[PDB]
């Protein structure tokens, strides 16, 4: 991705990312936007067209009005973790909400990157009309959905395999190469999706 294209994506994200009120880690918030800027501009422009907001948060997700109804609720796939949405650092789908500083694997989650996994859910649901539950992807998911680990989450929910695979594809060259070797059909699928 040329510098001008990365800049173009950062400009597009400037219209999508919402920063919190009050004090927060501005450098880390910018670092999260920079990682999101590696997503194909086709998806980012569609997010902007749909007025999808990527909300960066200073506190828990359930402190936000729109997610208060999730207080005490155990998310899909989080059975046995002993936590509820109150403790979850990222949310994706019809909206996107992310806790600043929790990007890396092991910060209350086990994704390769918090913001790319969550935003992949929004792209899947809003931009691509739930392609992760299409018959085509379900066939790919049936074969390769257990090759990225966390088989009791990624290997069970096609939308989660899609989101994590999407994050692998776009985080950096290392993860992009790891996905190609582990899930070649998924890699080719995402490669064709961006054309």
């Amino acid at each position: 991705m040329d510098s001008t294209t990365i800049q173009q994506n950062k400009d597009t994200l400037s219209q999508i990312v919402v920063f919190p009120t009050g004090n927060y880690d501005k450098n880390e918030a910018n670092a999260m936007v920079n990682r999101l800027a590696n997503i194909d501009g086709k998806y980012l422009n569609a997010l902007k067209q749909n007025n999808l907001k990527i909300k960066l948060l200073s506190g828990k997700l359930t402190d936000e009005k729109e997610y208060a109804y999730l207080k005490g609720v155990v998310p899909k796939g989080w059975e046995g973790t002993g936590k509820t949405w109150d403790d979850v650092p990222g949310l994706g789908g019809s909206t996107v909400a992310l806790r600043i500083g929790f990007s890396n694997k092991g910060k209350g989650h086990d994704a390769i990157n918090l913001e790319l996994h969550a935003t992949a859910h929004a792209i899947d649901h809003i931009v691509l009309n739930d392609i992760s539950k299409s018959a085509q992807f379900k066939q790919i998911f049936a074969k390769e959905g257990r090759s990225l680990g966390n088989v009791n989450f990624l290997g069970v929910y096609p939308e989660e395999f899609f989101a994590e695979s999407f994050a692998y594809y776009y985080l950096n060259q290392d993860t992009n190469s790891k996905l190609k070797s582990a899930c070649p059909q998924t890699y080719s699928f995402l490669q064709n999706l961006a054309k």
């Binding site: 997610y67 999730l70 998310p75 899909k76 796939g77 949310l91 969550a118 989450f153 990624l154």
Partner: peptide, 7 residues
């Protein structure tokens, strides 16, 4: 639609 981060 809501989906959580990977546990």
């Amino acid at each position: 639609e809501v989906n959580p981060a990977v546990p």
